[PDB]
Write a protein that binds this ligand. Sequence first.
Ligand code: ZXC
Length: 291
Amino acid sequence: NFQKVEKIGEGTYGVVYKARNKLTGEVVALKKIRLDTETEGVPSTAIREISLLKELNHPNIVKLLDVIHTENKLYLVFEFLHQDLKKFMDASALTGIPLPLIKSYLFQLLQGLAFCHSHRVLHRDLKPQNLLINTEGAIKLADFGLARAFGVPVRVVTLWYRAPEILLGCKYYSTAVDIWSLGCIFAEMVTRRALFPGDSEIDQLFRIFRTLGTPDEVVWPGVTSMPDYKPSFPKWARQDFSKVVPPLDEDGRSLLSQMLHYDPNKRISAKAALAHPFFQDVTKPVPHLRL
Ligand SMILES: O=C(Nc1ncnc2[nH]cnc12)c1cccs1
């Protein structure tokens, strides 16, 4: 029922094609979901989880158009967008993305997050490659909720945006994990360099600690009892944000600090972040996009 137009890439869960729906003419992103058994068919809890996502609709969430479970295989049909934030950042490297556009994108992403989180759905794997942009100035979160439905594999899956509680082996993390990832992405928009580009779980942890300080029981009650916490972690002091994300203004640096609080219970929520004075002068610029 779908004509493949071209291969978009290898996604987190399998190959993704730009395709045309033969009975509506709609152009879509068609995602084949890799079965690990392949042979046993689609686990039923995955189908039920994914089916729930068909209802979690918001303008800043890439729309799940259809779920097709046939021949004991799984395909997801998503709304197609022409650019991603990773590609847009690479393109804007000389000049950087203008503040007003960073601000608009951050605000839109926080709306999408606050919607999802109010329904107790997390993303868990936000990263620039899953932040998609249209010609209208919109940015939208892709693959929302797929991590809970299918798992997140090691394969390399980037660790750069992973929250510290996940890295310390917490099993029962919260919506705070997405706020951490979006804070990382905010910082990368501003500086044009990834904030914490680890190449292993411990390198990721120690890059975080080198910037934000090694966490202790003062800033994060309970941290020393986390599964993968080690008393022998090096004890680094915290750096100034003014060093970390120049030339971001005081309001941005305030917001960023709250999004990168170690204690997930103290980390700002998406709802609260929408109220932050950083967004007092937010607008919706139209991006400069060549397709
Ligand atoms: O799926 C990807 N990119 C995508 N590109 C256009 N529209 C999409 N809607 C949902 N995902 C989309 C991937 C990018 C790189 C690998 S897969």
